[PDB]
Design a protein around this ligand. Structure first.
Ligand SMILES: Cc1ncc(C(=O)Nc2cn3ccnc3c(CN3CCN(C(=O)C4CCCC4)[C@@H](C)C3)c2C)cn1
Ligand SMILES: Cc1ncc(C(=O)Nc2cn3ccnc3c(CN3CCN(C(=O)C4CCCC4)[C@@H](C)C3)c2C)cn1
Length: 225
Protein backbone atom coordinates (compact mmCIF):
# COMPACT_ATOMS: atom_id res chain seq x y z
CA UNK A 1 0.00 0.00 0.00
CA UNK A 2 1.11 3.57 -0.78
CA UNK A 3 1.59 6.33 1.81
CA UNK A 4 -1.55 8.08 0.52
CA UNK A 5 -3.56 4.85 0.76
CA UNK A 6 -2.44 4.40 4.39
CA UNK A 7 -3.21 8.03 5.31
CA UNK A 8 -6.69 7.73 3.77
CA UNK A 9 -7.30 4.51 5.71
CA UNK A 10 -6.43 6.28 8.99
CA UNK A 11 -8.82 9.16 8.23
CA UNK A 12 -11.65 6.81 7.14
CA UNK A 13 -11.39 4.75 10.35
CA UNK A 14 -11.23 7.86 12.56
CA UNK A 15 -14.26 9.45 10.87
CA UNK A 16 -16.17 6.16 11.13
CA UNK A 17 -15.48 6.09 14.88
CA UNK A 18 -16.50 9.73 15.43
CA UNK A 19 -19.74 9.33 13.47
CA UNK A 20 -20.77 6.17 15.37
CA UNK A 21 -20.47 7.56 18.92
CA UNK A 22 -23.68 7.95 20.97
CA UNK A 23 -22.41 11.27 22.36
CA UNK A 24 -19.58 13.42 21.01
CA UNK A 25 -16.49 13.52 23.27
CA UNK A 26 -16.87 17.30 23.74
CA UNK A 27 -20.38 16.69 25.14
CA UNK A 28 -19.14 14.00 27.57
CA UNK A 29 -16.31 16.27 28.73
CA UNK A 30 -18.62 19.27 29.18
CA UNK A 31 -20.91 17.17 31.41
CA UNK A 32 -18.14 16.03 33.81
CA UNK A 33 -19.11 18.86 36.18
CA UNK A 34 -22.73 17.66 36.11
CA UNK A 35 -22.76 15.09 38.94
CA UNK A 36 -25.87 13.34 40.35
CA UNK A 37 -26.82 14.75 43.75
CA UNK A 38 -27.16 12.60 46.88
CA UNK A 39 -30.94 12.70 46.32
CA UNK A 40 -30.63 11.53 42.71
CA UNK A 41 -28.29 8.67 43.70
CA UNK A 42 -30.75 7.56 46.40
CA UNK A 43 -33.45 7.66 43.71
CA UNK A 44 -31.53 5.27 41.45
CA UNK A 45 -30.73 2.90 44.33
CA UNK A 46 -34.45 2.67 45.17
CA UNK A 47 -35.35 1.49 41.65
CA UNK A 48 -36.12 -2.19 41.11
CA UNK A 49 -33.39 -4.44 39.74
CA UNK A 50 -35.64 -4.97 36.73
CA UNK A 51 -36.00 -1.23 35.99
CA UNK A 52 -32.25 -0.74 36.34
CA UNK A 53 -31.72 -3.69 34.00
CA UNK A 54 -34.10 -2.11 31.43
CA UNK A 55 -32.23 1.21 31.65
CA UNK A 56 -28.81 -0.46 31.26
CA UNK A 57 -30.03 -2.85 28.53
CA UNK A 58 -31.48 0.12 26.63
CA UNK A 59 -28.10 1.87 26.72
CA UNK A 60 -26.22 -1.32 25.80
CA UNK A 61 -28.53 -2.09 22.85
CA UNK A 62 -27.79 1.37 21.43
CA UNK A 63 -24.05 1.00 22.12
CA UNK A 64 -23.96 -2.39 20.31
CA UNK A 65 -25.97 -0.99 17.38
CA UNK A 66 -23.41 1.81 17.03
CA UNK A 67 -20.51 -0.70 17.11
CA UNK A 68 -22.26 -2.72 14.38
CA UNK A 69 -22.48 0.49 12.31
CA UNK A 70 -18.79 1.21 12.97
CA UNK A 71 -17.90 -2.30 11.74
CA UNK A 72 -19.91 -1.88 8.53
CA UNK A 73 -17.97 1.33 7.83
CA UNK A 74 -14.55 -0.40 8.04
CA UNK A 75 -12.91 -0.95 4.65
CA UNK A 76 -13.45 -4.51 3.46
CA UNK A 77 -15.80 -5.58 6.28
CA UNK A 78 -18.94 -5.63 4.14
CA UNK A 79 -17.05 -7.51 1.42
CA UNK A 80 -16.40 -10.39 3.84
CA UNK A 81 -18.81 -13.33 3.65
CA UNK A 82 -21.77 -13.20 6.05
CA UNK A 83 -20.27 -15.95 8.24
CA UNK A 84 -17.03 -14.05 8.83
CA UNK A 85 -18.83 -10.74 9.49
CA UNK A 86 -20.82 -12.58 12.17
CA UNK A 87 -17.77 -14.33 13.67
CA UNK A 88 -15.99 -10.96 14.02
CA UNK A 89 -19.05 -9.25 15.53
CA UNK A 90 -19.84 -12.05 18.01
CA UNK A 91 -16.30 -12.05 19.36
CA UNK A 92 -15.61 -8.33 19.15
CA UNK A 93 -18.71 -6.11 19.42
CA UNK A 94 -18.97 -6.25 23.22
CA UNK A 95 -15.18 -5.88 23.54
CA UNK A 96 -15.43 -2.62 21.58
CA UNK A 97 -18.35 -1.54 23.80
CA UNK A 98 -16.18 -2.08 26.91
CA UNK A 99 -13.29 -0.11 25.40
CA UNK A 100 -15.60 2.73 24.28
CA UNK A 101 -16.93 3.03 27.86
CA UNK A 102 -13.66 4.74 28.90
CA UNK A 103 -14.75 7.87 26.97
CA UNK A 104 -17.52 8.32 29.53
CA UNK A 105 -15.37 7.54 32.59
CA UNK A 106 -13.93 10.33 34.74
CA UNK A 107 -10.80 9.09 36.53
CA UNK A 108 -10.56 12.23 38.72
CA UNK A 109 -13.57 11.15 40.85
CA UNK A 110 -14.30 7.59 39.63
CA UNK A 111 -17.65 8.47 38.01
CA UNK A 112 -19.37 7.49 34.75
CA UNK A 113 -21.84 9.26 32.47
CA UNK A 114 -25.30 7.69 32.72
CA UNK A 115 -28.64 9.16 31.63
CA UNK A 116 -27.54 12.81 31.63
CA UNK A 117 -25.12 13.15 34.56
CA UNK A 118 -22.06 11.55 36.14
CA UNK A 119 -22.36 9.12 39.04
CA UNK A 120 -20.26 6.56 40.88
CA UNK A 121 -20.54 2.77 41.10
CA UNK A 122 -23.18 3.11 43.83
CA UNK A 123 -25.73 4.40 41.27
CA UNK A 124 -26.10 0.81 40.09
CA UNK A 125 -26.67 -0.82 43.49
CA UNK A 126 -30.07 -2.34 42.58
CA UNK A 127 -28.44 -4.53 39.90
CA UNK A 128 -26.57 -6.59 42.52
CA UNK A 129 -23.52 -6.67 40.23
CA UNK A 130 -20.95 -4.88 42.39
CA UNK A 131 -18.01 -7.20 41.57
CA UNK A 132 -18.60 -7.02 37.81
CA UNK A 133 -19.27 -3.27 37.72
CA UNK A 134 -16.15 -2.71 39.84
CA UNK A 135 -14.19 -4.73 37.25
CA UNK A 136 -15.64 -2.61 34.43
CA UNK A 137 -14.78 0.60 36.34
CA UNK A 138 -11.22 -0.73 36.92
CA UNK A 139 -10.83 -1.49 33.21
CA UNK A 140 -11.95 2.05 32.24
CA UNK A 141 -9.61 3.49 34.90
CA UNK A 142 -6.63 1.60 33.45
CA UNK A 143 -7.63 2.73 29.93
CA UNK A 144 -8.02 6.37 31.04
CA UNK A 145 -4.40 6.36 32.29
CA UNK A 146 -3.30 5.80 28.66
CA UNK A 147 -4.94 9.10 27.68
CA UNK A 148 -6.19 7.72 24.35
CA UNK A 149 -6.65 10.39 21.72
CA UNK A 150 -9.74 10.20 19.50
CA UNK A 151 -7.66 8.77 16.64
CA UNK A 152 -5.93 6.24 18.89
CA UNK A 153 -9.18 4.81 20.21
CA UNK A 154 -10.64 4.68 16.67
CA UNK A 155 -7.72 2.68 15.32
CA UNK A 156 -7.44 0.47 18.40
CA UNK A 157 -11.16 -0.43 18.33
CA UNK A 158 -10.98 -1.18 14.61
CA UNK A 159 -8.27 -3.71 15.46
CA UNK A 160 -10.35 -5.20 18.29
CA UNK A 161 -12.89 -6.11 15.58
CA UNK A 162 -10.64 -6.96 12.63
CA UNK A 163 -8.71 -9.92 14.04
CA UNK A 164 -7.89 -12.93 11.86
CA UNK A 165 -7.20 -15.11 14.92
CA UNK A 166 -10.93 -15.45 15.76
CA UNK A 167 -11.92 -19.15 15.60
CA UNK A 168 -14.48 -20.07 12.93
CA UNK A 169 -13.42 -17.75 10.09
CA UNK A 170 -13.96 -19.18 6.59
CA UNK A 171 -11.85 -16.62 4.69
CA UNK A 172 -8.95 -16.22 7.14
CA UNK A 173 -6.51 -14.78 4.56
CA UNK A 174 -8.98 -12.04 3.63
CA UNK A 175 -9.31 -10.96 7.28
CA UNK A 176 -5.48 -11.21 7.65
CA UNK A 177 -5.10 -8.68 4.86
CA UNK A 178 -7.54 -6.20 6.41
CA UNK A 179 -5.92 -6.64 9.83
CA UNK A 180 -2.44 -6.06 8.42
CA UNK A 181 -3.54 -2.89 6.57
CA UNK A 182 -5.13 -1.52 9.75
CA UNK A 183 -2.04 -2.37 11.81
CA UNK A 184 0.14 -0.58 9.23
CA UNK A 185 -2.15 2.46 9.54
CA UNK A 186 -2.09 2.33 13.36
CA UNK A 187 1.72 1.98 13.54
CA UNK A 188 2.25 4.68 10.92
CA UNK A 189 -0.07 7.05 12.79
CA UNK A 190 1.57 6.38 16.15
CA UNK A 191 5.02 6.98 14.66
CA UNK A 192 3.91 10.32 13.17
CA UNK A 193 2.39 11.50 16.46
CA UNK A 194 5.28 10.12 18.59
CA UNK A 195 2.81 7.93 20.47
CA UNK A 196 4.32 4.49 19.89
CA UNK A 197 4.70 4.38 23.70
CA UNK A 198 1.04 3.31 23.98
CA UNK A 199 1.53 -0.10 22.25
CA UNK A 200 3.09 -1.97 25.17
CA UNK A 201 0.50 -0.32 27.46
CA UNK A 202 -2.58 -1.60 25.58
CA UNK A 203 -4.79 -3.87 27.70
CA UNK A 204 -3.70 -7.51 27.63
CA UNK A 205 -6.15 -9.28 25.28
CA UNK A 206 -6.69 -12.11 27.77
CA UNK A 207 -7.88 -9.46 30.25
CA UNK A 208 -10.27 -7.85 27.74
CA UNK A 209 -11.71 -11.20 26.57
CA UNK A 210 -12.17 -12.48 30.14
CA UNK A 211 -13.91 -9.26 31.23
CA UNK A 212 -16.11 -9.39 28.11
CA UNK A 213 -16.92 -13.03 28.84
CA UNK A 214 -17.93 -12.21 32.44
CA UNK A 215 -19.97 -9.23 31.26
CA UNK A 216 -21.83 -11.16 28.54
CA UNK A 217 -22.43 -14.03 31.00
CA UNK A 218 -24.23 -11.65 33.39
CA UNK A 219 -26.14 -9.95 30.55
CA UNK A 220 -27.46 -13.33 29.42
CA UNK A 221 -28.54 -14.18 32.99
CA UNK A 222 -30.56 -10.92 33.12
CA UNK A 223 -32.08 -11.56 29.68
CA UNK A 224 -33.32 -14.99 30.79
CA UNK A 225 -34.95 -13.58 33.94
C1 LIG B 1 -29.41 -2.52 9.12
C2 LIG B 1 -29.28 -3.26 10.45
N1 LIG B 1 -30.23 -4.13 10.84
C3 LIG B 1 -30.13 -4.79 12.00
C4 LIG B 1 -29.03 -4.60 12.84
C5 LIG B 1 -28.95 -5.35 14.15
O1 LIG B 1 -29.73 -6.28 14.26
N2 LIG B 1 -28.09 -5.01 15.15
C6 LIG B 1 -27.98 -5.63 16.37
C7 LIG B 1 -28.06 -4.82 17.45
N3 LIG B 1 -28.00 -5.30 18.66
C8 LIG B 1 -28.08 -4.63 19.79
C9 LIG B 1 -27.99 -5.47 20.84
N4 LIG B 1 -27.86 -6.74 20.17
C10 LIG B 1 -27.88 -6.56 18.93
C11 LIG B 1 -27.78 -7.56 17.86
C12 LIG B 1 -27.64 -9.02 18.24
N5 LIG B 1 -26.26 -9.39 18.61
C13 LIG B 1 -26.18 -10.63 19.43
C14 LIG B 1 -24.71 -11.11 19.48
N6 LIG B 1 -23.92 -9.99 20.00
C15 LIG B 1 -23.13 -10.16 21.10
O2 LIG B 1 -22.45 -9.25 21.55
C16 LIG B 1 -23.05 -11.48 21.85
C17 LIG B 1 -22.74 -12.67 20.91
C18 LIG B 1 -22.05 -13.70 21.85
C19 LIG B 1 -21.08 -12.81 22.65
C20 LIG B 1 -21.85 -11.47 22.85
C21 LIG B 1 -23.96 -8.70 19.29
C22 LIG B 1 -23.23 -8.55 17.92
C23 LIG B 1 -25.45 -8.29 19.17
C24 LIG B 1 -27.82 -7.10 16.59
C25 LIG B 1 -27.73 -8.10 15.45
C26 LIG B 1 -28.05 -3.68 12.42
N7 LIG B 1 -28.20 -3.04 11.24
C1 LIG C 1 -24.57 8.45 25.95
C2 LIG C 1 -23.64 7.57 26.75
N1 LIG C 1 -22.42 7.25 26.26
C3 LIG C 1 -21.56 6.46 26.96
C4 LIG C 1 -21.94 5.98 28.22
C5 LIG C 1 -21.03 5.08 29.03
O1 LIG C 1 -20.24 4.38 28.42
N2 LIG C 1 -21.13 5.04 30.39
C6 LIG C 1 -20.46 4.22 31.26
C7 LIG C 1 -19.11 4.07 31.22
N3 LIG C 1 -18.51 3.24 32.05
C8 LIG C 1 -17.22 2.99 32.14
C9 LIG C 1 -16.99 2.05 33.10
N4 LIG C 1 -18.32 1.78 33.55
C10 LIG C 1 -19.14 2.49 32.90
C11 LIG C 1 -20.60 2.56 33.05
C12 LIG C 1 -21.23 1.68 34.12
N5 LIG C 1 -22.24 0.73 33.58
C13 LIG C 1 -22.87 -0.03 34.69
C14 LIG C 1 -24.06 -0.88 34.17
N6 LIG C 1 -23.64 -1.64 32.97
C15 LIG C 1 -23.93 -2.96 32.82
O2 LIG C 1 -23.62 -3.59 31.81
C16 LIG C 1 -24.66 -3.77 33.89
C17 LIG C 1 -25.95 -4.44 33.32
C18 LIG C 1 -26.07 -5.78 34.08
C19 LIG C 1 -24.60 -6.25 34.16
C20 LIG C 1 -23.79 -4.96 34.43
C21 LIG C 1 -22.96 -0.92 31.87
C22 LIG C 1 -23.81 0.01 30.96
C23 LIG C 1 -21.76 -0.15 32.49
C24 LIG C 1 -21.25 3.43 32.25
C25 LIG C 1 -22.76 3.61 32.31
C26 LIG C 1 -23.22 6.32 28.69
N7 LIG C 1 -24.04 7.11 27.96
Amino acid sequence: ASLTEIEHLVQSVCKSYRETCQLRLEDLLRQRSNIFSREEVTGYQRKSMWEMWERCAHHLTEAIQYVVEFAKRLSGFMELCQNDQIVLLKAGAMEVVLVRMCRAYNADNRTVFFEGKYGGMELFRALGCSELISSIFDFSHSLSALHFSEDEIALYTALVLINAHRPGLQEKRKVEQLQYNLELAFHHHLSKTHRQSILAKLPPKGKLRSLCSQHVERLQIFQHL
